[PDB]
Structure formats: C-alpha cells, structure tokens
Amino acid sequence: XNXXX
Amino acid sequence: TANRLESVECLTFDWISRNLYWTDGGLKSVTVLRLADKSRRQIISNLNNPRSIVVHPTAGYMFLSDWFRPA
Numbered sequence: 001x002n003x004x005x
Numbered sequence: 006t007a008n009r010l011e012s013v014e015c016l017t018f019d020w021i022s023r024n025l026y027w028t029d030g031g032l033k034s035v036t037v038l039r040l041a042d043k044s045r046r047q048i049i050s051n052l053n054n055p056r057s058i059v060v061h062p063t064a065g066y067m068f069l070s071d072w073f074r075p076a
Contacts, residue, residue: 002054002072004014004030 006038006045014056021062028055028069035069 011031018025023040035049035058049055053073060067070076 004012 006043015058017058017060019060019062024060026058026060026067028052028058030054030056035067 009032011029013027014030015028016025017027024037025040026035026037028035032047033052033055034047035052035055036045037048038045049069052069052071055069055071058067058069
C-alpha cells in the first residue's frame with residue numbers, strides 16, 4: 001500500500 | 006507548532022511571504038502558518054489521502070497530490 005507508516 | 010497535528014506528511018515554505026504550509030493525513034486538510042506571528046488557518050479542508058505540497062511564491066500557485074482511488 002501507499003501508507004507512510 | 007505542536008497543537009492539533011495528526012500526520013504531517015509534507016511541509017513547504019513560501020520564503021518571500023514567510024509562510025510554512027503543511028498537509029495532514031488524519032485531519033485531511035492543508036494548513037498554512039506564518040513565522041512572524043503563529044497565525045494559522047486550514048486553507049483546504051476536505052481531502053482524502055493528500056501527500057506532497059509545493060508552493061510557487063512568484064507565480065502565486067500551490068500544488069498538492071491526493072492518492073485516493075480517483076487520484
């Protein structure tokens with residue numbers, strides 16, 4: 001996914 | 006700044022006007038703040054997954070990207 005965390 | 010931040014995914018600086026702009030992934034907004042006095046307002050309010058922001062001080066434009074499904 002493109003989640004920063 | 007440390008009041009009301011939830012995920013500050015990017016910063017950028019309008020060096021001519023002395024304004025710092027940032028994007029928040031949890032509030033889902035763009036905030037701007039000035040460094041001469043700590044004045045701040047959410048200038049854009051209802052994004053989805055906003056990420057990068059950039060500001061062109063001379064042209065007066067700002068650009069930001071939302072990566073939600075209709076990106």
